[PDB]
Amino acid sequence: VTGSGKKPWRQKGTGRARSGSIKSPIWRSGGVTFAARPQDHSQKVNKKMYRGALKSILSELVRQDRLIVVEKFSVEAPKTKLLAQKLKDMALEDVLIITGELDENLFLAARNLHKVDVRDATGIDPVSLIAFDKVVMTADAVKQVEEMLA
Amino acid sequence: RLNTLSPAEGSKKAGKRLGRGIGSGLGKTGGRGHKGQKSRSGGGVRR
Amino acid sequence: MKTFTAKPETVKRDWYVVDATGKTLGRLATELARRLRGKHKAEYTPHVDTGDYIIVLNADKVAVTGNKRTDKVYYHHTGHIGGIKQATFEEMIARRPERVIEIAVKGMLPKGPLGRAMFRKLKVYAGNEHNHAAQQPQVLDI
Amino acid sequence: MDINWRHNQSTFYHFTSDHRISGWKETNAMYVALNSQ
Amino acid sequence: MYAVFQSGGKQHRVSEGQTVRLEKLDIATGETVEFAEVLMIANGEEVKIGVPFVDGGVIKAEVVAHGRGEKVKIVKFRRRKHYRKQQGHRQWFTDVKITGISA
Amino acid sequence: METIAKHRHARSSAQKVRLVADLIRGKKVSQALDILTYTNKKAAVLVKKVLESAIANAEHNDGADIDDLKVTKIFVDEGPSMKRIMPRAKGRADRILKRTSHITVVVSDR
Amino acid sequence: AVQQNKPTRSKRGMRRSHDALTAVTSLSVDKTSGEKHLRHHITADGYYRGRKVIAK
Amino acid sequence: ARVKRGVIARARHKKILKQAKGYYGARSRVYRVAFQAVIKAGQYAYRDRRQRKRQFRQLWIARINAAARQNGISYSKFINGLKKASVEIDRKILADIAVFDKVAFTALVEKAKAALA
RNA sequence: UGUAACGGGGCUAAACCAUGCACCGAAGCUGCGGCAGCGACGCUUAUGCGUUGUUGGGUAGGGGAGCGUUCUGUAAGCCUGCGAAGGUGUGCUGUGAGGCAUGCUGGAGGUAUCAGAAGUGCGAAUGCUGACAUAAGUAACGAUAAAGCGGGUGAAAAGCCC
RNA sequence: CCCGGCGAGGGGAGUGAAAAAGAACCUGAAACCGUGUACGUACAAGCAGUGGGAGCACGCUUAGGCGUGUGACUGCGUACC
């Protein structure tokens, strides 16, 4: 705190309480007692606990019928209108499309749709499998997922 | 279902917060008794 | 339900005349204190004056035992400093005997506003007659 | 007025005078201490 | 005509058609109870108990309302020793109504 | 009909004004003016100007007939203090509270 | 020389029970001018007991 | 995450000051004095939920003692009599009969003197 | 300092001694109602009860279980100008921290549930800052060189101008 | 427009959805200070409450004898850290 280390009054004889710095944490304008620093909040997750967790959530997406397996899922042109109509035809609004080969046109078609997210089979995370209502995996993505999760 | 996940039973223990009130159990002296070198900030003898 | 409380608007209270000739001072005094509290009535209530009006007469003829006629000393202090003023029992009977019965009863009655109101009901006379023939006091033989 | 009041509360904060209580207040504390000895 | 009867823990002096607040009985709300342990019946001739409870007397009372009484705060402060403890309490009651008193 | 006049921020503390206000409270208005004319206070000048303003607001902004009016409410609130400094001895200062007030006269015929 | 417990507002008003101002109590009416004035004083127009005085 | 503490502190203080309405002076205005007043009222209220049982009992005993001496027997002898007569009327009710029903109380005194002789 | 060595009145028994029977007397024991802990025990099995025994004063201190606050996810959801937060009352409710509903003010935001992180709860520190009391309409109004009157100006003159 | 000292401040009028949104301006708490109403209080001693509790005033209420405010009198009671 931007101040001076001058003691504000004499130690004894004023009837004031004794004080030593104008930057004390009890004083207004004074400096937080246990002031924070920038910190790292990362936790270690063991690799077998990460993979175990993905196996549990995939097993529950299968068990709760939130996992849809299509053979192919690609859009004609990079238009959000086409993907909106395609997801409308399949009775899906909130959806995580996951494809073993990341199509460019699908990626550009889902970039404006709020509820819809397109991933590659490599970059799936627990919070999106749990977050989205339905997960639509390409069959190739299913094979790559089994190769990842052994 | 991210608002239905829940930890195990017994895994997250609370954490002692000292200095808050009479009911909490650890207020005024925080569990460190009356005066002495050990009830002092920084206080304690070496190993 | 709740325990009955006497209501001071609706307390009926009687008038009694007691002849204090040859009675012992403390024993008469204790009976009067009991009757002025209202302890003899089933509607007794500790914050209500339920007692009776007693007319003590012949107060100069009250008796004490032993040498208390001359050795019992009534001290009081006047507020000025060396103001300790004593008076024996026979000096009090000569000067004002009403003060003898009234000091006794007053010390037997609860101190406080209520017991002052209880003492206002005691009427003591040094003689044999009283002005209170209008209230028709019946003769309390005690 | 507020500035003059903060500075004129800040007048006897760094004092030295020992016969005067708090730098300014007159007393008899020299004789009180001296007689206590 | 009143009657004194023993009830939950304690005793009650009750006429007919009078609502009494007893302790919590284990009875349904509209159900009728009987107190077979009456200690006094007075009409203009007293009837009471040489050996206790009167031989021929009973009180029929209809339960009116189970309930839970006024909250009271219980405060336990030990001055100067760093101890205070507050607590609360609402007592269960049972309002019955005296249907009849049989001498 | 109640008719209000106020002097907000009147340089006189509310205690000193409340003496005068306590004089004229409840009176008929001509009697209240005769009391404030012959009260030797500074507050009686202030209270008289508020009362005269309330009679005028009554007779102009509302129904007339001064002679029926009565001082129903009068009260003196406290206003903001002006915080000044008195230089005392040995180098010490004091705050002087130069106190204001808020005079309210509610006059009415009913 | 200084108080030892802060006095209440009760005791404060009790002390001020006597600080009340007395009213005028009735002011008298001139004989000639018919106007009002303090008794034994001259009027605002400068009369007293029905005769003209000062006249400024 | 800085937490300002104005709104909840206001609620606690206000809770305590509502529990102190009717107290004289600062005891009903200032928090720091109304807290002590409210606690000391709590301790007294506890203590007096016990004393009201003691005080009511001594009131009842004084009324039965008065009415029973009106019927020519003391309280001590009357309670002994009724216990020997095997009467189990508690003394709330004996005080209440002794006020409201003089004839029933007279009859209770007759049971007490009957068994006591 | 004032009786002033029975708490007091007062007592010749209302004192002492001996015997006896009563009664008063506590948060003790019992009765009735309720809650909680630790055992045991037949099921219920992931625990509750017909039970059942017993325990529940507490400082330093140890153990257990919770409430609230702000922030993140759930939440582009759900409340909200038919009126949010906040403020101020009332009513109901829980063993408690507390919760819920609603009148008036307010005028635009709030957030379930289940998780997560804490600048997470103040009456004290001759605590820090602001506000406001208290003494109190009290002391004082700063050289004991000294003022008085007439007139003017003015809304008003002991103090200004002549 | 009116009071007012060609003031200060205010009362109307008008704008405004709202001027107790008026520039001393969103919300507007508490301490502190008032005005009005109900009750108590001028023979009564003390941590100012608490247990009991009459009376009075307002609301009820098919008088059901309740609720709120006050609180004479009375037992007990020497703040917090």
From Swiss-Prot, chain A:
Consequence recorded when altering residue 116 to D: Does not regulate the S10 operon in vivo
GO BP annotations listed: cytoplasmic translation; DNA-templated transcription termination; negative regulation of cytoplasmic translation; negative regulation of DNA-templated transcription; negative regulation of translation; response to antibiotic; ribosome assembly; transcriptional attenuation
Statement: the UniProt record of this protein carries the keyword Transcription: yes
GO cellular component, one term: cytosol
Chain segments carrying region Disordered: 1-20
Record annotation: effect of changing residue 83 to P: Does not regulate the S10 operon in vivo
Keywords: Antibiotic resistance, Repressor, Ribonucleoprotein, Ribosomal protein, RNA-binding, rRNA-binding, Transcription, Transcription regulation, Transcription termination, Translation regulation
Example of a GO MF term: rRNA binding
Transmembrane annotation, as ranges: none
Oligomer and partners: Part of the 50S ribosomal subunit. In TnaC-stalled ribosomes forms part of the binding pocket for L-Trp with the leader peptide and uL22.
Misc: The erythromycin sensitive allele is dominant over the resistant allele.
Stated family: Belongs to the universal ribosomal protein uL4 family.
Protein name listed in UniProt: Large ribosomal subunit protein uL4
Lineage: Bacteria, Pseudomonadati, Pseudomonadota, Gammaproteobacteria, Enterobacterales
Gene name of the encoded protein: rplD
Residues of the full protein shown: 52 to 201 of 201
UniProtKB/Swiss-Prot annotation, chain B:
Superkingdom in the source lineage: Bacteria
Comp. bias (Gly residues): 20-30
Region (Disordered), start-end ranges: 1-47
Subunit structure: Part of the 50S ribosomal subunit. Contacts the 5S rRNA.
Protein's job: This protein binds the 5S rRNA. It is required for the late stages of subunit assembly, and is essential for 5S rRNA assembly onto the ribosome.
Family: Belongs to the universal ribosomal protein uL15 family.
Protein name: Large ribosomal subunit protein uL15
Gene label: rplO
From Swiss-Prot, chain F:
Entry keywords, A to Z: Antibiotic resistance, Ribonucleoprotein, Ribosomal protein, RNA-binding, rRNA-binding
Ribonucleoprotein listed as a keyword: yes
Any one GO CC term of the record: cytoplasm
Name of the featured protein: Large ribosomal subunit protein uL22
InterPro entries per the UniProt record, alphabetical: Ribosomal_uL22, Ribosomal_uL22_bac/chlpt-type, Ribosomal_uL22_bac/org-type, Ribosomal_uL22_CS, Ribosomal_uL22_sf
UniProt-listed HAMAP family: Ribosomal_uL22_B
Transmembrane region(s): none
Gene Ontology biological-process annotations: assembly of large subunit precursor of preribosome; cytoplasmic translation; cytosolic ribosome assembly; response to antibiotic; ribosome assembly; translation
UniProt xrefs under Gene3D superfamilies: Ribosomal protein L22/L17
Note: The wild-type allele (erythromycin sensitive) is dominant over the resistant allele, and is also dominant over the temperature-sensitive allele at both low and high temperatures.
Family: Belongs to the universal ribosomal protein uL22 family.
Binding residues for L-tryptophan: 90
Pfam annotation, one family: Ribosomal_L22
Family matches, as SUPFAM superfamilies: Ribosomal protein L22 (SSF54843)
UniProtKB/Swiss-Prot annotation, chain H:
Signal peptide: none
One Pfam family from the record: Ribosomal_L20
Domain of life of the organism encoding this protein: Bacteria
GO BP annotations listed: cytoplasmic translation; ribosomal large subunit assembly
GO MF terms held by the record: large ribosomal subunit rRNA binding; mRNA binding; mRNA regulatory element binding translation repressor activity; structural constituent of ribosome
One GO CC term on file: cytosolic large ribosomal subunit
Keywords: Ribonucleoprotein, Ribosomal protein, RNA-binding, rRNA-binding
PANTHER family: 39S RIBOSOMAL PROTEIN L20 (PTHR10986)
Subunit structure: Part of the 50S ribosomal subunit. Contacts L21.
Family statement drawn from the similarity comment of this UniProt entry: Belongs to the bacterial ribosomal protein bL20 family.
Function comment: One of the primary rRNA binding proteins, it binds close to the 5'-end of the 23S rRNA. It is important during the early stages of 50S assembly.
HAMAP family: Ribosomal_bL20 (MF_00382)
Name of the protein: Large ribosomal subunit protein bL20
